[PDB]
């Protein structure tokens, strides 16, 4: 499973 993308947390 892919790690969550920090971009969905901070822009």
């Amino acid at each position: 499973p892919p790690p969550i993308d920090n971009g969905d947390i901070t822009s």
Epitope: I4, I9, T10
Partner: antibody, heavy 119, light 114 residues
């Protein structure tokens, strides 16, 4: 430089609620996800919850899921934690934490606010 | 949920000597698609809030002195303080951020032997 000041801690009776705040300064609050993390006295760090930059995304620890609600107010540069159904094991320092640019880490921490659940 | 286990619970080091803190993840923290390890280290000196030391296993945060080295890949990680100084007494925490819930190792206390 970046500053996070927590507030709202104190003592609460078992069963009741408490709302914490985090006043962020020294960066564009609108662009960053923010976390709540806690530490029972003499104990380890425990991630509580996070809310994304624009507020459309949350995640909670299982420990608090359904009991706690993270929210934020971007124009007022403020992060909140609404805590419900508190128990003595929720007793802890509650740190507000800023997310890294960078990587999903907490790069800056407030000093925390101390919450005590007791009779 | 990814479980992070540190070893040991406590180190007592002579000034100028080496402290080695181990951190073991229950899940591979390496992402094939970018070859980065989603692992961080934090330092929390007594009475203070935590500070971020390392991320992507080995990238130092700004201001972190160069006696601190983060390394490892996969499930097995390490924080080494070469040549320990008095300031460095603290509890050190590893943390995965591969996936929610963000999870911390239990902490490793470091003290000086004198």
């Amino acid at each position: 430089e970046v500053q996070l000041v927590e507030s709202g801690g104190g003592v609460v009776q078992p069963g009741r609620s408490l709302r914490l705040s985090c006043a962020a300064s020294g960066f564009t609050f609108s662009r960053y996800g923010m976390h709540w993390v806690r530490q029972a006295p003499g104990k380890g760090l425990e991630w509580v919850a996070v809310m994304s930059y624009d507020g459309s995304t949350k995640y909670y620890a299982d420990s608090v899921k359904g009991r706690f609600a993270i929210s934020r107010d971007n124009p007022k540069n403020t992060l909140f934690l609404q805590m419900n159904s508190l128990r003595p094991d929720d007793t802890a320092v509650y740190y507000c934490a800023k997310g890294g640019a960078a990587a999903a880490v907490m790069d800056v921490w407030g000093k925390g606010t101390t919450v005590t659940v007791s009779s | 949920d990814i479980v992070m286990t540190q070893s040991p619970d406590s180190l007592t080091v002579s000034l100028g000597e080496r402290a080695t803190i181990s951190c073991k993840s229950s899940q591979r923290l390496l992402y094939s698609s970018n070859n980065k390890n989603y692992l961080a280290w934090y330092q929390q000196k007594p009475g203070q809030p935590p500070k971020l030391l390392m991320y992507w296993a080995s990238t130092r945060e700004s201001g972190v002195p160069d006696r601190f080295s983060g390394s490892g890949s996969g499930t097995d990680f390490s924080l080494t303080i070469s040549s320990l100084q008095a300031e460095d007494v603290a509890v050190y925490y590893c943390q995965q951020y591969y996936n929610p819930p963000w999870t911390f190792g239990q902490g490793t206390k470091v003290e000086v032997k004198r």
